[PDB]
Coordinates of C-alpha atoms and ligand atoms in Angstrom, one line a residue:
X1 CA -43.5 -25.7 36.1
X2 CA -42.1 -28.5 33.8
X3 CA -39.2 -29.0 30.7
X4 CA -41.9 -28.5 27.5
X5 CA -40.2 -30.1 24.2
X6 CA -38.9 -33.1 26.1
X7 CA -40.3 -36.0 25.6
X8 CA -38.8 -38.4 28.6
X9 CA -37.6 -42.4 28.2
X10 CA -37.6 -44.3 31.0
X11 CA -34.0 -45.8 31.9
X12 CA -34.5 -48.4 33.7
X13 CA -33.4 -51.3 31.7
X14 CA -30.0 -49.2 31.3
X15 CA -27.0 -49.9 33.3
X16 CA -27.3 -46.4 34.7
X17 CA -29.4 -48.5 37.2
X18 CA -27.1 -51.2 38.0
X19 CA -24.7 -51.6 41.1
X20 CA -21.4 -50.3 40.2
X21 CA -18.2 -50.2 43.0
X22 CA -16.1 -46.6 43.0
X23 CA -13.8 -47.3 46.1
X24 CA -14.9 -48.0 49.0
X25 CA -19.2 -47.0 47.9
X26 CA -21.9 -49.6 46.5
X27 CA -23.6 -47.3 43.8
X28 CA -26.5 -48.4 43.6
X29 CA -27.2 -46.5 40.4
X30 CA -24.0 -44.6 38.0
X31 CA -26.7 -41.1 37.8
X32 CA -23.9 -38.7 39.7
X33 CA -24.0 -35.0 41.4
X34 CA -21.0 -33.5 39.6
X35 CA -19.3 -30.8 41.6
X36 CA -22.2 -27.4 41.0
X37 CA -20.7 -24.3 42.8
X38 CA -24.0 -22.1 44.8
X39 CA -22.8 -20.0 46.5
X40 CA -24.5 -20.4 49.6
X41 CA -21.9 -20.6 52.8
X42 CA -21.0 -18.0 54.8
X43 CA -18.9 -14.7 55.2
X44 CA -16.1 -14.1 57.4
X45 CA -14.8 -18.3 57.2
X46 CA -16.3 -19.8 53.9
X47 CA -18.7 -21.3 56.4
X48 CA -20.9 -24.3 55.3
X49 CA -24.7 -22.6 55.5
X50 CA -25.5 -23.1 58.9
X51 CA -29.1 -23.4 57.8
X52 CA -29.6 -24.7 54.4
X53 CA -26.7 -26.9 53.4
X54 CA -27.5 -29.8 55.1
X55 CA -31.3 -29.8 53.5
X56 CA -30.1 -29.0 50.2
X57 CA -27.5 -32.7 50.1
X58 CA -30.1 -34.5 52.4
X59 CA -33.0 -34.2 49.1
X60 CA -30.7 -34.8 46.4
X61 CA -29.5 -37.8 48.8
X62 CA -32.5 -38.9 48.5
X63 CA -31.9 -42.3 46.2
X64 CA -29.7 -44.8 48.8
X65 CA -26.6 -45.4 46.5
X66 CA -26.1 -41.9 45.0
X67 CA -22.3 -40.8 45.3
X68 CA -22.4 -36.9 45.4
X69 CA -19.6 -34.8 44.7
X70 CA -20.0 -32.1 46.6
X71 CA -19.7 -28.6 45.9
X72 CA -16.6 -27.0 45.7
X73 CA -13.9 -26.5 48.5
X74 CA -11.0 -24.4 49.8
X75 CA -7.6 -25.8 51.1
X76 CA -7.3 -23.0 52.0
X77 CA -7.4 -18.8 52.5
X78 CA -5.2 -19.2 49.7
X79 CA -7.1 -21.4 47.7
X80 CA -10.4 -19.5 47.3
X81 CA -11.4 -15.9 46.6
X82 CA -15.0 -16.4 46.3
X83 CA -16.3 -14.4 49.4
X84 CA -19.7 -17.7 49.1
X85 CA -17.8 -20.6 48.7
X86 CA -16.9 -23.1 51.4
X87 CA -13.8 -24.7 52.8
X88 CA -11.8 -27.7 54.2
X89 CA -9.6 -26.2 56.5
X90 CA -10.8 -24.5 59.7
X91 CA -12.6 -26.5 62.3
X92 CA -15.3 -24.1 62.1
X93 CA -15.8 -25.5 59.0
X94 CA -15.4 -28.8 59.6
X95 CA -18.0 -29.3 61.9
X96 CA -20.5 -27.6 59.4
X97 CA -19.4 -30.6 56.8
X98 CA -19.0 -32.8 59.5
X99 CA -23.2 -32.9 59.6
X100 CA -24.0 -33.1 55.8
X101 CA -21.5 -35.9 55.4
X102 CA -24.1 -37.9 58.3
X103 CA -27.6 -36.8 56.7
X104 CA -25.7 -38.1 53.9
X105 CA -25.0 -40.9 55.1
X106 CA -27.8 -42.1 56.5
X107 CA -29.5 -41.1 53.0
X108 CA -27.6 -44.3 52.6
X109 CA -26.0 -42.4 49.9
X110 CA -21.6 -41.4 49.9
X111 CA -19.8 -38.4 49.3
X112 CA -16.1 -36.7 48.2
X113 CA -16.0 -34.1 48.7
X114 CA -14.3 -31.3 45.5
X115 CA -10.8 -29.8 46.8
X116 CA -10.9 -26.6 44.6
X117 CA -8.1 -24.5 43.7
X118 CA -10.0 -20.6 41.5
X119 CA -6.0 -19.7 40.8
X120 CA -7.4 -17.4 38.5
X121 CA -9.9 -17.1 37.9
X122 CA -10.8 -15.2 41.5
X123 CA -12.1 -11.9 42.5
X124 CA -8.1 -10.8 43.1
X125 CA -9.6 -7.9 45.2
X126 CA -11.0 -10.2 47.4
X127 CA -7.5 -11.1 48.0
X128 CA -6.2 -8.2 48.4
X129 CA -8.3 -7.2 51.3
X130 CA -7.4 -10.6 53.3
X131 CA -4.0 -9.8 51.8
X132 CA -3.6 -13.0 49.6
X133 CA -1.9 -13.5 46.7
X134 CA -3.5 -13.3 43.0
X135 CA -2.0 -16.2 42.4
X136 CA -1.4 -18.0 39.1
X137 CA 1.2 -20.8 36.0
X138 CA 2.4 -17.1 34.9
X139 CA 2.0 -12.6 35.0
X140 CA 2.2 -12.2 31.4
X141 CA -0.9 -13.5 30.6
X142 CA -4.3 -12.7 32.1
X143 CA -7.8 -14.8 32.3
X144 CA -9.3 -11.3 30.3
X145 CA -9.8 -8.3 30.7
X146 CA -12.5 -7.4 33.1
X147 CA -10.3 -9.8 35.8
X148 CA -6.5 -7.9 34.5
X149 CA -8.9 -4.0 35.4
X150 CA -9.5 -6.3 38.7
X151 CA -6.0 -7.5 39.9
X152 CA -4.1 -3.5 39.0
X153 CA -8.0 -1.2 40.7
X154 CA -6.4 -3.9 43.7
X155 CA -2.7 -3.7 43.1
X156 CA -2.6 -7.5 43.0
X157 CA -1.2 -8.3 40.0
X158 CA -0.8 -11.8 38.8
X159 CA 1.7 -13.6 41.0
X160 CA 3.0 -17.0 39.5
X161 CA 3.6 -19.4 41.6
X162 CA 7.2 -20.3 42.5
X163 CA 8.9 -23.8 43.7
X164 CA 7.9 -23.4 47.7
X165 CA 4.5 -22.2 46.9
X166 CA 3.7 -25.2 45.1
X167 CA 4.8 -27.5 47.8
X168 CA 3.3 -25.0 50.3
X169 CA -0.3 -26.2 48.3
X170 CA 0.0 -29.8 47.9
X171 CA 1.0 -29.5 51.9
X172 CA -2.4 -28.0 52.4
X173 CA -4.4 -30.6 49.6
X174 CA -2.9 -33.0 52.4
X175 CA -4.7 -32.0 54.7
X176 CA -7.4 -30.2 53.5
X177 CA -7.9 -34.7 51.7
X178 CA -7.6 -35.9 55.7
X179 CA -9.4 -33.5 57.0
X180 CA -12.3 -34.0 54.9
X181 CA -11.8 -37.5 55.7
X182 CA -11.5 -37.2 59.5
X183 CA -15.4 -35.6 59.2
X184 CA -16.5 -39.4 57.6
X185 CA -15.9 -37.8 54.0
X186 CA -16.3 -41.0 51.6
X187 CA -13.4 -39.4 49.6
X188 CA -12.2 -36.5 47.8
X189 CA -12.1 -35.7 44.2
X190 CA -9.1 -33.8 43.0
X191 CA -10.8 -30.2 41.3
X192 CA -8.1 -29.7 38.3
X193 CA -10.5 -29.2 35.4
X194 CA -12.6 -25.6 34.0
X195 CA -9.9 -23.5 34.1
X196 CA -8.5 -23.2 38.4
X197 CA -5.2 -23.5 38.7
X198 CA -4.0 -27.1 38.3
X199 CA -6.0 -27.1 34.4
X200 CA -3.6 -23.9 34.0
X201 CA -0.3 -25.4 34.5
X202 CA -2.5 -28.8 32.7
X203 CA -2.7 -26.2 29.4
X204 CA -0.2 -24.5 27.3
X205 CA -2.1 -20.7 26.6
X206 CA -2.1 -20.4 30.0
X207 CA 1.5 -21.8 31.0
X208 CA 4.6 -20.6 29.7
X209 CA 6.9 -21.9 32.7
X210 CA 10.3 -22.7 31.7
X211 CA 11.0 -24.2 34.6
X212 CA 9.4 -28.4 35.1
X213 CA 6.2 -27.2 36.2
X214 CA 6.1 -26.1 32.3
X215 CA 7.5 -26.2 29.3
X216 CA 6.1 -30.1 27.2
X217 CA 4.2 -31.9 28.0
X218 CA 5.4 -33.6 31.1
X219 CA 6.7 -30.9 33.0
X220 CA 2.6 -29.2 32.5
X221 CA 0.9 -32.4 34.0
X222 CA 3.6 -32.1 37.0
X223 CA 1.6 -29.9 39.2
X224 CA -1.5 -32.4 39.6
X225 CA 0.4 -35.4 39.6
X226 CA 2.1 -35.1 42.1
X227 CA -1.2 -33.2 44.0
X228 CA -2.4 -37.1 43.1
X229 CA 0.8 -38.3 44.0
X230 CA -0.1 -36.8 48.1
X231 CA -2.9 -37.4 48.4
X232 CA -2.8 -41.2 47.0
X233 CA 0.0 -41.7 49.7
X234 CA -1.9 -39.4 52.0
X235 CA -5.6 -40.7 52.2
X236 CA -5.3 -44.1 50.2
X237 CA -5.7 -43.6 46.3
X238 CA -9.2 -45.4 46.3
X239 CA -10.5 -42.2 48.5
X240 CA -9.0 -40.5 45.4
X241 CA -10.4 -38.8 42.2
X242 CA -9.5 -36.8 39.2
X243 CA -11.4 -34.4 37.0
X244 CA -10.7 -33.0 33.4
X245 CA -11.8 -30.5 31.7
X246 CA -9.6 -31.3 27.8
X247 CA -11.9 -29.4 25.2
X248 CA -13.0 -27.4 27.8
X249 CA -12.5 -23.6 27.2
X250 CA -13.5 -21.8 30.7
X251 CA -12.2 -19.6 32.7
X252 CA -10.2 -19.1 28.5
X253 CA -8.5 -22.7 28.7
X254 CA -7.5 -23.6 25.2
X255 CA -10.0 -26.1 24.1
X256 CA -9.3 -27.5 21.1
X257 CA -8.0 -24.7 18.9
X258 CA -4.7 -26.4 20.3
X259 CA -3.4 -29.0 18.4
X260 CA -1.4 -30.8 21.1
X261 CA -3.9 -30.3 24.1
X262 CA -5.2 -34.3 23.4
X263 CA -1.8 -35.3 23.5
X264 CA -2.0 -33.1 27.0
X265 CA -4.7 -35.4 28.5
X266 CA -3.9 -38.6 27.2
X267 CA -0.3 -38.6 28.7
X268 CA -1.8 -37.2 32.2
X269 CA -4.2 -40.7 31.9
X270 CA -1.2 -42.8 31.0
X271 CA 0.2 -41.9 34.7
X272 CA -2.6 -42.5 36.4
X273 CA -3.1 -46.2 34.2
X274 CA 0.1 -46.4 34.9
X275 CA 0.1 -46.1 39.5
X276 CA -3.0 -48.1 38.9
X277 CA 0.0 -50.7 37.8
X278 CA 1.0 -50.1 41.3
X279 CA -1.6 -51.2 42.1
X280 CA -2.0 -47.8 43.1
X281 CA -5.4 -46.9 40.5
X282 CA -7.7 -43.7 41.6
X283 CA -11.3 -45.2 42.5
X284 CA -11.5 -43.2 39.6
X285 CA -11.1 -40.5 37.3
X286 CA -14.2 -37.4 36.0
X287 CA -14.4 -36.3 32.5
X288 CA -16.2 -32.7 31.3
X289 CA -17.5 -33.3 28.5
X290 CA -16.7 -31.9 25.1
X291 CA -19.6 -31.2 24.7
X292 CA -19.5 -28.1 27.7
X293 CA -16.4 -25.9 27.2
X294 CA -17.9 -23.7 29.6
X295 CA -20.4 -24.8 32.3
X296 CA -22.3 -21.3 32.6
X297 CA -24.0 -20.6 29.4
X298 CA -27.5 -21.9 27.8
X299 CA -28.1 -25.1 27.2
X300 CA -26.4 -25.9 24.2
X301 CA -25.0 -23.1 22.6
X302 CA -21.0 -24.5 23.4
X303 CA -19.6 -27.7 22.5
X304 CA -17.2 -29.5 19.5
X305 CA -17.9 -31.7 16.5
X306 CA -14.5 -32.5 15.9
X307 CA -13.3 -33.7 19.4
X308 CA -14.4 -36.1 22.6
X309 CA -12.8 -37.7 25.1
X310 CA -13.6 -41.5 24.1
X311 CA -10.1 -41.0 24.3
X312 CA -9.8 -41.7 27.7
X313 CA -10.7 -45.2 27.4
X314 CA -8.7 -46.1 25.4
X315 CA -6.1 -45.5 27.8
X316 CA -7.9 -45.6 31.1
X317 CA -9.1 -48.6 32.8
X318 CA -10.5 -48.0 35.9
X319 CA -14.1 -46.3 36.0
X320 CA -15.6 -42.9 34.3
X321 CA -18.0 -40.3 34.9
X322 CA -18.8 -38.3 32.2
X323 CA -20.6 -34.7 32.6
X324 CA -22.6 -32.2 30.6
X325 CA -26.4 -32.2 29.1
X326 CA -27.1 -35.4 29.8
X327 CA -30.3 -35.1 31.8
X328 CA -32.1 -33.8 28.0
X329 CA -30.9 -37.1 26.4
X330 CA -31.7 -39.9 27.7
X331 CA -30.8 -41.4 23.9
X332 CA -27.3 -40.7 24.0
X333 CA -26.9 -41.7 27.2
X334 CA -28.6 -45.1 26.6
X335 CA -26.2 -45.4 23.9
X336 CA -23.3 -43.8 26.3
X337 CA -23.8 -46.5 29.6
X338 CA -23.8 -49.8 27.4
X339 CA -20.3 -49.3 28.5
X340 CA -19.4 -51.3 31.8
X341 CA -17.3 -48.5 33.8
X342 CA -18.9 -45.2 32.5
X343 CA -21.1 -42.7 35.3
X344 CA -23.4 -40.3 34.1
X345 CA -23.6 -36.8 36.6
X346 CA -26.2 -34.6 35.9
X347 CA -25.6 -30.5 37.0
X348 CA -27.9 -28.4 35.9
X349 CA -31.4 -30.7 36.2
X350 CA -29.8 -32.1 39.7
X351 CA -30.0 -28.3 40.7
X352 CA -33.9 -28.4 40.0
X353 CA -34.5 -32.1 40.1
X354 CA -33.6 -33.0 43.8
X355 CA -35.8 -36.6 43.0
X356 CA -33.8 -37.0 39.6
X357 CA -32.5 -40.7 39.3
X358 CA -36.9 -41.8 40.0
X359 CA -37.0 -39.8 36.8
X360 CA -34.5 -41.3 34.9
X361 CA -35.5 -44.5 36.4
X362 CA -39.2 -43.7 35.3
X363 CA -39.1 -41.1 33.0
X364 CA -41.4 -38.9 33.9
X365 CA -40.8 -34.6 33.5
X366 CA -38.0 -33.0 35.3
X367 CA -38.6 -29.2 36.6
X368 CA -37.4 -26.5 34.9
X369 CA -34.0 -24.8 36.9
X370 CA -34.5 -21.5 37.5
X371 CA -30.6 -20.2 36.8
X372 CA -31.0 -16.8 39.1
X373 CA -31.0 -19.1 41.8
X374 CA -28.0 -20.6 41.2
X375 CA -25.3 -18.8 43.0
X376 CA -27.6 -16.7 44.8
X377 CA -27.3 -16.2 49.1
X378 CA -31.2 -17.6 49.4
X379 CA -32.7 -21.5 49.6
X380 CA -35.3 -20.1 46.8
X381 CA -34.2 -21.9 44.2
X382 CA -31.7 -24.3 46.0
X383 CA -33.7 -26.4 48.0
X384 CA -37.4 -25.6 47.7
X385 CA -37.2 -27.6 44.5
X386 CA -40.2 -30.1 44.4
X387 CA -40.0 -33.6 43.6
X388 CA -42.7 -35.3 41.5
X389 CA -45.0 -35.6 43.8
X390 CA -45.2 -32.3 45.5
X391 CA -45.2 -30.9 41.5
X392 CA -48.0 -32.8 40.6
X393 CA -49.8 -31.5 43.3
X394 CA -49.1 -27.7 42.8
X395 CA -49.9 -28.7 39.8
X396 CA -46.2 -28.0 37.4
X397 CA -47.7 -29.6 34.9
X398 CA -50.7 -27.1 34.1
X399 CA -53.7 -29.7 34.0
Ligands
FMN401 C1 -24.6 -24.1 39.1 C2 -23.5 -24.2 38.5 C3 -22.6 -24.7 39.4 C4 -21.3 -25.6 38.5 N1 -19.9 -25.3 40.0 C5 -19.2 -25.9 39.1 C6 -18.0 -26.2 39.6 O1 -17.4 -25.4 40.8 N2 -16.6 -27.0 39.5 C7 -16.6 -26.9 38.4 O2 -15.8 -28.1 38.0 N3 -18.1 -27.2 37.7 C8 -19.0 -26.6 37.9 N4 -20.7 -27.0 37.2 C9 -20.1 -27.8 35.4 C10 -20.9 -28.8 35.9 O3 -19.8 -29.7 37.3 C11 -21.0 -30.2 35.2 O4 -20.4 -30.3 34.6 C12 -22.4 -29.1 34.5 O5 -22.8 -28.6 34.5 C13 -22.4 -29.6 32.8 O6 -23.8 -30.5 33.8 P1 -25.3 -30.9 33.3 O7 -25.2 -29.6 31.7 O8 -25.6 -31.9 32.4 O9 -25.9 -28.9 33.9 C14 -21.4 -25.8 37.5 C15 -22.4 -25.9 36.7 C16 -23.2 -25.7 37.8 C17 -24.7 -26.0 36.3
MG402 MG1 -53.5 -32.4 42.5

């Protein structure tokens, strides 16, 4: 079952296949695997699937020199909220993560742990059960209707983080980052996009605070930057990444509707480039394409014609990973990669194609992804996707 009506194009002759260096890693191509939640972690314990996780990542580390940003990992119990998402706070979890990283490194690929904190995107009932607060930037604005419904049902109102709680969250980022490197992770990517906690602070719609963590560009960017400054000093700026989704409106973020959103983000990028001067330039900056403001929806629905991230290029001088609907558009990838410091993140199709990189370099048919197994406790739709050879022998081309 390959994708029809799609005319592939060999990209082997573009820079997509030219070696670049990110942090301490020396990639052999520039097609990256962005953080993809698959929800196969175990419960209780948010334990990395002791059965399929290793095989899954291994299958996608097959192409040597692949930079793999793992699926979102909770830094601690409070930062979580989804029973089947993995974490990087306990020993039990670190024992399973170490096995995955060795599988990845063994295939001569790299791995970067994405540090995840759901904020208001977390299920409140799940938090009330473990005795956890329902965190967020404020208490008078909720994600949406179904959420303020669960918040009340479990009498777990949306709590507005105080100063000491952010510091506690910042203590956990350093520990999650440390444990990650301790086990052989090539680095860590601070997840500050798609409407999760940090993003909830960056966004003016979700951030109605008055203190130094709200009330202005400077203040709404305070949290994310303290985390940046925290992990940089603890593990080394060459082991830290940052993800942002300027025009994303996922998890009820402002997006391009807010006029000063571009200022909110140009500020952040400038501060990175600032530290980039003190000799402390984060390994990279990962951006979710405006083309994709909602990670969870059809392939084409939800974009912005009056907004682009090309502005970050005018401020940030380090590498840039751009992610969002690129597999079925090699014409756009061919052009976007003429920039010597731009990598490309493929999500949906790395899920369906374990040997994606080879299929880009040669212009071969892409495996269709099954939307129903994105988040499912199963191997089917997780690790049984065929490689180009396996798909052929199976007559996937419908002869
Ligand atoms: C099943 C699935 C899970 C995802 N999980 C996450 C996540 O945990 N964090 C995140 O920031 N983005 C997440 N994304 C968005 C991806 O990082 C990526 O930006 C998105 O797939 C857009 O690229 P694509 O259109 O080429 O797939 C997810 C996407 C999918 C399809
Ligand atoms: Mg045959």
